[PDB]
Amino acid sequence: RVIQPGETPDGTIGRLVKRLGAPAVRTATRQAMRLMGNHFVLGETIEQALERGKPGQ
Amino acid sequence: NIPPPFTAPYAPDDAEIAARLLPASHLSPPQEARIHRTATRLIEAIRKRLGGVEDM
């Protein structure tokens, strides 16, 4: 999509952006990305998760 | 002409000062809209986030 400027900040992310500012929200998202990638073993199916979490270890 | 040695009342009444400053502070809505935007952008940049003493 193309994002028109001056969009009223609604939604959970919009309200967050209004309170913290867009760049902090981007920073918080990247941290959440580190947390999701490091502390969770996830996949679309269980086989994908199980393959991801693999370690002769 | 060189001004006289500076002597202003040391501690005048706050209210009388505010009575002049409050109306003169008025800005038109496009003026306020521009200030709001510039300030928002300046503050958001500051919240991007090593930093400073306040952070420590």
CA distance B44 to chain A (A): 5
Q: Report the residue of B41, B48, B55 to disrupt the A interface, i.e. the one with the largest count of A CBs within 10 Å.
A: B48
Breaks (C-N over 2.5 A) in chain A follow: 55
Resolution stated for this PDB structure, in Å: 2.3
- Technique behind this structure? X-ray
The DSSP string of A6-27 is S----HHHHHHHHHH-HHHHHH
d(CA A27, CA A32): 9
Q: Which residues contact B43 (CB under 8 A, 6 or more apart)?
A: A21
